[PDB]
């Protein structure tokens, strides 16, 4: 039953943890072992006789469950060894496993595929031959097919694909067509309204801005995430969201009317009711103050300064009052004489 499968999963997980500290893991025999696990997975008579059984045996099949379970273990073990010991992360040692990785990618269960994505993300930097390199291109195609069938991006398999898709763009020379990215960003936008389980996608969003790929939806990303900064409560989401939106602003081109509206938001957001929401804006304001063009600072000196003293004059949270006073302190020395 499923419950026992969870129990068996827990036990199998512990064995892997022990294998990590095991001195054998430093030995090369383990790869031959993992390879071993990889290939291991893939009437007239009755008219006389007396029969006295009343219960029929139910048709059932678990042999598939065995193969998936062994494959999940093997992939899980294989990723641990290469991550821990760098020398095994070389082209020569892992050539034999590439055909198995391709099989597992098409494997039904997503847990094994998730592992297949994890190990692949390790190997994107690693060089490979002609036939061992197509796997990266093919896996890029598959994860889009994963996003296809998935009703919602907020699934464990879906995030891991974006993580791979981000790392695919960041490192590998070949890049996907803009239309595919547009749809992926389209699918990310609604599910992004629940950032709590979207943590990986932000890194993929961070990937595109890092490469400065131009998409129409990316402007819509910037507006939604800026709201997430001052609204979502998890600090981790606020931190990553701050980077991408701030990264989006200082690079991507924007019309002058647009620029004022965002800077219009942040000064307004300094009056946000929740203290953390006011706090989360402060780092962004401070980032502008810490690093920005003097001309940009000069246009904004009067606006930011008094919004800062205002909160510093009246604030239900002393810390925000303290931070606002501090940001003024690091503000004034940089200000121009006229400002």
């Amino acid at each position: 039953n499923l419950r026992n499968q969870n129990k068996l999963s827990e036990l199998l997980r512990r064995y892997l943890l022990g294998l990590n500290h095991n001195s054998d893991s430093e030995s090369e025999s383990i790869l031959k072992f993992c390879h071993q696990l990889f290939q291991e997975s893939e009437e007239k008579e009755d008219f006389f006789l007396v029969n006295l059984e009343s219960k029929s045996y139910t048709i059932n099949s678990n042999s598939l469950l065995l193969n998936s379970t062994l494959q999940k273990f093997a992939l899980d073990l294989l990723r641990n060894v290469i991550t821990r010991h760098r020398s095994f992360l070389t082209v020569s040692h892992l050539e034999g496993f590439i055909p198995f990785l391709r099989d597992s990618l098409l494997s039904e269960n997503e847990g094994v595929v998730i592992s297949t994505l994890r190990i692949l993300i390790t190997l994107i930097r690693l060089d490979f031959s002609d036939e061992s390199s197509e796997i990266f291109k093919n896996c890029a195609r598959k994860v889009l097919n994963i996003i296809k069938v998935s009703p919602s991006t907020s699934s464990e398999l879906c995030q891991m694909g974006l993580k791979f898709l981000s790392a695919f763009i960041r490192h590998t020379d070949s890049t996907l067509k803009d239309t595919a990215l547009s749809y992926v960003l389209g699918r990310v936008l609604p599910d992004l309204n629940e950032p709590s389980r979207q943590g990986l996608a932000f890194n993929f969003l961070k990937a595109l801005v890092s490469k400065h790929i131009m998409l129409p939806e990316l402007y819509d990303i910037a507006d939604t995430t800026r709201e997430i900064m001052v609204t979502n409560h998890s600090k981790e989401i606020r931190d990553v969201s701050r980077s991408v939106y701030y990264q989006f602003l200082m690079e991507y081109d924007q019309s002058k009317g647009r620029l004022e509206k965002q800077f219009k938001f942040m000064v307004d957001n300094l009056q946000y009711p929740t203290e953390s929401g006011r706090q989360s804006v402060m780092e962004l304001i401070n980032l502008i103050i810490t690093k920005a063009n003097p001309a940009l600072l000069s246009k904004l000196s009067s606006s930011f300064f008094l919004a800062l003293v205002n909160v510093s004059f009246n604030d239900d949270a002393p810390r925000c009052r303290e931070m606002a006073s501090v940001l003024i302190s690091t503000m004034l020395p940089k200000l121009e004489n006229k400002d």
Partner: peptide
């Protein structure tokens, strides 16, 4: 949208 990402 299903068709665009297909290509």
């Amino acid at each position: 949208a299903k068709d665009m990402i297909k290509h």
